[PDB]
Amino acid sequence: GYESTRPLRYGEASLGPGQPLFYIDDEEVDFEKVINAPLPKVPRDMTFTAHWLAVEGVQPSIPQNPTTAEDLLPKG
Amino acid sequence: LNLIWDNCLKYNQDMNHPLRRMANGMRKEADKLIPLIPDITIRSRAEVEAEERRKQINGMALVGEEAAEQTYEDEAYKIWKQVTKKDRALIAKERYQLFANNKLNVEEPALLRTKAGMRRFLKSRREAEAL
C-alpha cells in the first residue's frame, strides 16, 4: 500500500504542552467518486534522437546543447 | 574624364594596347554613373546673401591577356569575383604566409576551431534552409 500516487499529508494532535502527536490524514469516500473518476494522461512512447556534442574539441551553440550562460577548465 | 581619355590615347597612339580598352570601359562606367551628380555650384553664403539682399612588364602582359580572354565570360561570374575578391586575397595571403619556403613556420597563428566561426556557419545554414 505504499505505491499510491496520492499526496501524503499529516495531521497534528496535541497531547499537551510540548507533546504533539501526528497521524495520517484519511477521509472516507464514496465508491461513485472513485469508480467514475477519469484516468491520468498517457505519456508518449520511448524514442531517441542524435546531435553533435562537440566537433574537434569545441561545443557547437545549437538548441540541443546547453547555453553558455549555464568547473570545466583547470586554473592552477 | 574627357581629357583623361584623350591623354591616354595621345601618349600611347597604339590603338591595340589593352590600356585604351580599359579606358574605354572606364569611360563606359563614367557614362553609367555620371547622371547622379547634379550641377551644383559652391556659392559662398556672402555671395548668395548679397545676391538675396540686392533682390530684396610581364604583369601588364598578363593583364592584357586576361582582358582579351574576357571576350568569353559571364556577368554573374564577374559579380562573384567582385564580391569575393577581398576575402579570397586575405585567406590566400594568410595561407601563403603559413607555409613560407615549404617549411612549417613555428611563429604564425595556429589553426584552431572557434565558436564564432561555427555560429557564422549556422547562420549560413539557416539562410540555405530558408530556400
Contact (Cβ atoms closer than 8 angstroms) between residue B11 and residue B5: no
Contacts 24+ apart (CB under 8 A), A34-41: A40/A5
Beta-carbon separation of B118 and A56 below 8 A: no
Amino acid occupying residue B110: A
In the A/B pair of chains, how many CB contacts fall below 8 A?
17
Whole-number Å distance between alpha carbons of B69 and B66: 5
Task: Provide CB contacts within 8 A for A57, sequence distance 6+.
Answer: B113
Distance, first Cα to last Cα, chain A = 54
Whole-number Å distance between alpha carbons of B116 and B120: 6
Whole-number Å distance between alpha carbons of B9 and B12: 5
Whole-number Å distance between alpha carbons of B27 and B59: 23
Tell me which method was used to determine the 3D structure. cryo-EM
Instruction: Determine contact: A54 vs chain B, CB below 8 A.
Output: no
Whole-number Å distance between alpha carbons of B97 and B106: 11
The SS3 call for residue A33 is helix
Rounded alpha-carbon distances, angstroms, from residue B75 to B23, B79, B82, B120 = 19, 6, 11, 28
The SS3 call for residue A44 is coil
Contact (Cβ atoms closer than 8 angstroms) between residue B7 and residue B20: no
Instruction: Determine contact: A64 vs chain B, CB below 8 A.
Output: no
- Grid look-up 598578363 returns B62
The DSSP result for A45-73, as a single string, is PP------S-BTTB----TTSPPTT---S
Q: Report angle CA B62, B64, B65 to the nearest 5 degrees.
A: 60
What residues of chain B have any CB closer than 8 angstroms to a CB in chain A? 113-115, 118-119, 122
Secondary structure tally for chain A: helices H, strands E: 1, 2
Beta-carbon separation of B114 and A56 below 8 A: no
CA distance A47 to chain B (A): 26
CA distance A51 to chain B (A): 14
As a whole number of angstroms, the longest Cα–Cα distance in chain A is 70
If you ran DSSP here, which 8-state letter would residue A4 be given?
Answer: -
CA distance A56 to chain B (A): 7
Burial of residue B23 (CB within 10 Å: 0-12, 13-18, 19+) is buried
Whole-number Å distance between alpha carbons of B77 and B66: 14
Amino acid occupying residue B109: P
Burial of residue A61 (CB within 10 Å: 0-12, 13-18, 19+) is middle
β-strands A13-14, A20-21 pairing: antiparallel
CB-hemisphere CA count at 13 Å for B84?
Answer: 9
Rounded alpha-carbon distances, angstroms, from residue B58 to A13, A73, B95 = 106, 56, 25
